[PDB]
Amino acid sequence: DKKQALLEAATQAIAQSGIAASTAVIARNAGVAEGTLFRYFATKDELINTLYLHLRQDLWQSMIMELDRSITDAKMMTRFIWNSYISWGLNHPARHRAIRQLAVSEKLTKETEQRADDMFPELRDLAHRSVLMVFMSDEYRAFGDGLXLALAETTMDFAARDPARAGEYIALGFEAMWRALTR
Amino acid sequence: DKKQALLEAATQAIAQSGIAASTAVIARNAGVAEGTLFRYFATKDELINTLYLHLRQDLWQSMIMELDRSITDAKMMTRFIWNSYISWGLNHPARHRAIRQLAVSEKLTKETEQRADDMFPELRDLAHRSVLMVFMSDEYRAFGDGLXLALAETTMDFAARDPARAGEYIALGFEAMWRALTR
Ligand SMILES: C=CCCOc1c(C(=O)OCc2ccccc2)ccc2ccccc12
Numbered sequence: 273d274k275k276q277a278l279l280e281a282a283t284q285a286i287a288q289s290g291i292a293a294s295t296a297v298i299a300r301n302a303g304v305a306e307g308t309l310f311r312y313f314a315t316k317d318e319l320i321n322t323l324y325l326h327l328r329q330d331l332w333q334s335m336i337m338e339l340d341r342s343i344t345d346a347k348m349m350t351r352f353i354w355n356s357y358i359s360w361g362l363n364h365p366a367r368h369r370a371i372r373q374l375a376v377s378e379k380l381t382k383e384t385e386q387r388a389d390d391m392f393p394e395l396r397d398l399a400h401r402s403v404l405m406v407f408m409s410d411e412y413r414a415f416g417d418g419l420x421l422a423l424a425e426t427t428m429d430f431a432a433r434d435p436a437r438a439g440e441y442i443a444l445g446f447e448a449m450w451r452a453l454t455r
Numbered sequence: 456d457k458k459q460a461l462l463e464a465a466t467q468a469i470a471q472s473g474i475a476a477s478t479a480v481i482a483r484n485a486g487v488a489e490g491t492l493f494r495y496f497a498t499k500d501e502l503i504n505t506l507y508l509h510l511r512q513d514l515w516q517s518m519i520m521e522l523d524r525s526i527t528d529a530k531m532m533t534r535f536i537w538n539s540y541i542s543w544g545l546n547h548p549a550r551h552r553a554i555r556q557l558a559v560s561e562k563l564t565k566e567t568e569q570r571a572d573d574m575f576p577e578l579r580d581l582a583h584r585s586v587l588m589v590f591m592s593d594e595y596r597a598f599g600d601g602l603x604l605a606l607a608e609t610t611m612d613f614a615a616r617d618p619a620r621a622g623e624y625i626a627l628g629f630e631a632m633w634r635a636l637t638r
Pocket residue numbers: 350371375395396398399402403407408413416417420421453454
């Protein structure tokens with residue numbers, strides 16, 4: 273209740289006013305005081321880190337029922353995942369704008385980064401089969417995610433403003449992402 | 456005086472509050488009335504179209520003194536231009552964030568799109584020398600610019616937050632852009 277009301281309030285605030293979102297206004301619009309929100313998340317970095325995983329799991333539950341592991345070709349599996357992310361972002365923009373801020377933020381730990389891989393081995397397995405090895409390194413992985421989500425957000429924006437041509441924007445966006453970020 | 460103040464307020468407002476920026480808040484931040492603004496831009500689309508050209512000409516003057524025309528290899532000339540844009544954006548974040556909104560906006564006419572090409576034949580010639588044919592077509596050109604400026608914005612953001620690795624972000628950003636947007 274109040275922990276996910278905070279998680280949904282943090283989503284709204286971080287998507288709008290950035291990750292420099294006040295702990296006060298995240299609390300106040302979740303119908304609580306600032307004191308309330310810090311015994312469920314010790315620090316603002318702990319709120320960031322589990323919201324990122326919460327949003328990550330929300331993206332995966334939108335997809336795994338439609339997910340078909342028959343595909344062995346990395347590019348066709350990435351395309352299904354790419355198509356699903358864009359649709360996920362179009363349906364709930366705040367969840368996308370928030371996860372884009374959290375993914376490229378310094379506050380993320382590798383218990384956030386190694387749980388995110390354990391939570392979703394299929395993506396891990398896929399990344400470890402196509403993505404450029406430099407965008408998997410601890411040093412530049414966040415940058416790849418930033419490139420990543422920049423190409424996706426641009427694809428969303430043209431797909432939502434020009435719905436009649438959305439399908440071509442998804443394909444073009446995917447191909448630009450694919451040759452940019454894979455071997 | 457007043458029109459360059461309108462253009463600089465429009466630069467601030469469109470980069471900050473998006474391209475849905477009120478003529479009210481553009482005017483009030485230029486120290487003028489709402490009436491005065493429409494004697495320098497007939498319509499808000501004229502403000503958009505003339506700000507885009509103003510910002511385009513500002514970006515090119517940051518580069519043309521350092522521009523070396525010796526190089527005939529497209530990738531080395533695009534890298535100098537890419538390196539120049541990133542530095543331009545780091546020095547003027549509002550001017551970059553604004554031109555990103557204007558470049559992907561429906562309000563831009565071809566009379567702006569043909570001025571941008573006549574004003575900068577080297578960019579046109581270089582674009583007409585390496586870029587994928589579909590990202591130059593009238594239909595998906597704005598999309599190419601968006602993918603474009605999305606990769607650049609991600610490069611700026613990681614370069615400004617992690618300065619010690621900035622040089623690596625510029626090269627990686629450029630190469631990811633290059634294989635994404637060229638043949
Ligand atoms: C490094 C840049 C890419 C991270 O993308 C990808 C992932 C992936 O695991 O993405 C992580 C992610 C982080 C934040 C939001 C959404 C996804 C997995 C497989 C991928 C296959 C091809 C391209 C991109 C892939």
